[PDB]
Each structure stands twice: as C-alpha cells, then as structure tokens.
C-alpha cells in the first residue's frame with residue numbers, strides 16, 4: 001500500500017494473509033469461518049499446494065501476540081474463465097481445512113447482494129484496500145498491516161484519465177478502477193488478493209479484490225480491482241456444494 | 255443508446271437546473287450529482303426530460319464544487335449496460351454555486367432550518383450594488399454583476 | 404413566465420429576464436415545483452431508504468431486507484445483528 005496508514009490492530013478483522021512455505025504470497029478476505037476470497041493469479045505458480053496457509057488475526061508480521069489463527073487451505077477454486085497469467089476473472093475462493101474462531105480480531109466481511117452492490121455500494125466513493133505488500137513500487141513490503149482509502153471510478157472515466165498504455169489488459173466488466181492518478185496513493189504487489197471494502201450504513205462489504213495496475217502509484221494510472229458483484233452467485237453456489245476431490249478446482253463461471 | 259451532451263448548469267439565486275441534449279428517442283435518463291469526494295446521489299429517475307432540477311442538493315453546501323453525470327438507458331431495458339457492464343453516461347462541468355450562480359433584500363433557494371435565506375445571508379460582505387442598480391460580488395471570477403432594474 | 408402561474412404544488416414564482424424562479428415547498432422540487440419527493444421510493448434511489456437490501460415490487464411498496472446474521476426491525480428499514488460477530492462489523496469499534 002503506497003500512501004496508506006497503519007490499519008489499527010483489529011480494524012481490518014477480515015484481512016487474511018496467505019503464505020507458501022512460510023513466505024508471504026498474497027492477501028485475502030474472510031467471508032465466513034472456512035471461506036476466504038483472494039485473487040486467482042496468486043496460485044499461478046503453486047506446486048506445493050499443501051504448503052499454503054492462511055492467517056487471520058495477523059497484524060504485525062515481526063511479533064506473534066495472542067491473536068493470529070492459522071489454517072491450511074484445503075481447496076482453491078478459480079473461475080473456469082480465468083487464464084493463468086491474465087488479469088481477467090481474477091478471483092479465488094479458498095476453503096480452509098478447519099474453520100477459524102471469530103473473535104474481536106477475526107470477523108468476516110459481508111459478501112453483499114449483487115443488486116445492492118451494483119446499485120448502492122458502487123456509488124459509495126471511497127472504499128479501503130489493505131495489505132503488507134510493497135510500500136513503494138519496488139520498495140519494501142510492510143510488517144504492520146497498511147490500509148488506504150481509494151475513490152472508485154466508472155470505467156469511462158478510468159479510460160478517459162489513464163495514460164494510454166503499457167502492454168495493459170483492458171478494464172473489462174469483471175474489473176473496475178480505484179485510486180489516484182497523481183502517483184501518491186495505490187495498492188501494490190504483495191497486496192494482490194486482499195479486499196476493497198465499502199462501508200454502507202454501518203456494515204462493510206467486499207466490493208473488490210486487489211488485482212493489477214501499471215506499477216504502483218504510476219502517474220496517469222489507477223489500480224484495477226476484480227468487480228466482485230459479477231461473482232456473488234458463483235461464490236455462494238460454491239459455498240453450498242460438496243467438497244470435490246481437488247486442491248486447485250476450476251469451477252464453471254458463470 | 256446515445257450519451258447526452260451539452261450538459262449545462264442554468265442557475266439564478268441558487269435555483270440550479272442542469273440541461274443537456276438530446277431529446278431522447280426510446281431511451282431515458284437518470285442524473286447523479288456528487289461533491290469531489292462525496293458519494294453520488296441519483297435524481298430525475300428514468301425521465302425523458304433533458305433537464306433536472308438539482309437545487310435541493312447544491313443548496314446543502316453552496317460552497318462545494320459539484321460534478322454531475324447523466325446516464326442513458328433504452329426504455330424497457332433500463333438495466334442496459336455497455337461492454338464494461340456499466341450504463342452509458344457523460345459528465346457535466348463542475349459547478350460551485352456560491353461562485354457561479356447568477357444573481358438577480360432577495361430570498362435565494364438556499365434554506366436553513368426549513369426557511370429560505372437571502373442574498374445577504376448567503377453573500378454577506380461579498381455583495382455590493384451599483385446605482386440603476388446592479389448587484390455585484392467583486393470577489394468573483396465569472397458572473398460578478400447581476401442585471402439591472 | 405409568472406403571469407402564467409408556472410409554479411405548481413404551492414410554489415411561488417419570481418420573474419427574471421424572461422425566466423422566473425419557482426420557490427417550492429419542502430416536498431417538491433423541479434423548475435415548476437412539480438416533482439413530488441415522496442414518490443421516488445425505489446431501490447435505485449438512496450437504497451429505498453433501507454439499511455441493507457431492497458426489493459421493489461410491482462404495484463406495491465418496496466421491501467427492505469437484511470443480511471444473514473441480522474434481522475429486519477419494526478421500522479421496516481433497519482437491521483440489527485442476531486449474532487456475536489455479525490459480518491462487516493468491527494468489534495473494537497462496537
């Protein structure tokens with residue numbers, strides 16, 4: 001998070017941290033005791049599918065206090081439409097091995113109803129993104145959890161304000177842009193998978209997933225997030241189906 | 255659907271209306287207004303009119319700078335969205351009521367605890383007059399003088 | 404302009420340079436105080452006034468709903484949690 005602040009311990013209770021063999025992988029969001037939503041591109045190079053863990057209650061990655069809870073990721077389900085290496089359909093639903101205990105430091109983020117998301121949350125201007133990823137484009141990842149309030153943009157305006165290229169993907173209808181284009185604030189690598197949470201009348205909902213961008217805080221660019229509204233159905237469905245016998249699972253999307 | 259164009263702000267004593275083009279052929283419009291960092295509030299839901307009264311909103315904080323946009327939907331499928339699954343729209347110019355509304359003791363459309371305020375209760379010492387009379391707000395860049403009587 | 408009593412629903416007109424200004428009553432807006440604020444109780448309009456979910460219905464008022472872990476209240480718009488750690492609530496700020 002470039003330009004953020006330190007998220008007070010316990011204020012980002014839905015923040016998950018994923019690790020592969022002890023090493024920081026991505027961020028993720030907790031939607032209920034055994035389900036986490038992250039970003040499909042984070043598992044493009046996981047050939048140790050069991051050495052993947054998720055941590056909740058985490059805040060400071062240097063000290064261990066009485067709050068962290070860790071679980072192995074039993075399964076990782078990605079849309080059948082996601083192509084490894086690309087940024088479209090960048091969503092992953094992770095089934096933990098055992099549930100977590102909700103405590104004052106571990107609470108899930110509400111997965112909003114699609115209509116409510118498209119029609120009401122989408123016009124809430126600022127939402128929060130968080131993580132322990134780089135603090136400058138190729139700077140150091142953080143140790144304490146960082147949170148940043150970014151404004152959302154409708155794609156016409158994103159396209160209208162971005163400096164035409166790099167070998168970018170397009171901003172499809174499965175993504176959205178949020179951020180600043182004056183290179184001051186943005187999410188960065190190491191933040192991928194974490195949440196874009198919107199506050200509406202007292203509750204917080206998951207509206208996006210940190211996905212991609214041109215560098216981090218590059219001038220003339222904004223950060224791109226997976227638009228979660230387009231996957232609710234899909235998620236809910238998967239969360240009510242039988243476990244099926246795979247670690248990586250590619251579920252039919254839509 | 256075609257996007258609206260020539261979005262203009264017509265405003266006098268804070269009565270603020272936005273107008274645009276075109277006159278819609280089998281499509282409707284909805285308008286949204288915000289402050290730079292405020293959430294967007296929708297108005298004139300699915301109308302065929304090419305104007306929208308945004309007074310109620312802008313007189314909440316006449317010193318904010320508002321931005322508005324107009325969405326266009328085919329009628330019937332007022333859930334029409336384009337390739338990036340969002341409805342077609344176009345933005346207006348910014349408008350800072352306190353500095354761009356036109357002037358004409360007068361009441362303004364600005365209200366405080368249910369009543370209306372007056373040209374002076376809104377512009378205090380930024381309002382001077384001329385003699386026939388003209389009202390002038392020298393602390394302006396545009397529309398600094400009113401008309402005459 | 405005003406001679407032609409253009410301001411409806413009790414508005415007052417003010418003539419201008421050909422134009423007029425209509426001062427409406429708290430419940431109406433529009434150039435001619437014609438729109439009624441009280442009739443746009445739809446979900447696209449400030450979430451229907453619901454705290455969480457809204458459903459619009461044909462010929463009948465819209466119904467507000469709540470997320471799993473919350474229950475709708477007497478007012479018909481607000482939700483309260485029926486659990487310990489309802490989703491999206493921050494316990495240390497509760």
Ligand SMILES: N=C(N)c1ccc2nc(-c3cc([C@@H](CC(=O)O)C(=O)O)cc(-c4cc(CNC(N)=O)ccc4O)c3O)[nH]c2c1
Nearest residue numbers: 041042044085187188189190192211212213214215216223
């Ligand atoms: N500006 C923003 N808002 C962002 C936000 C998140 C983000 N994540 C990234 C990531 C970029 C990469 C680059 C390398 C770079 O340093 O820029 C790549 O594509 O190889 C890799 C990312 C990956 C990639 C993988 C495995 N996937 C893969 N294709 O190799 C796992 C975890 C990551 O953080 C990433 O999140 N970039 C950004 C930019």
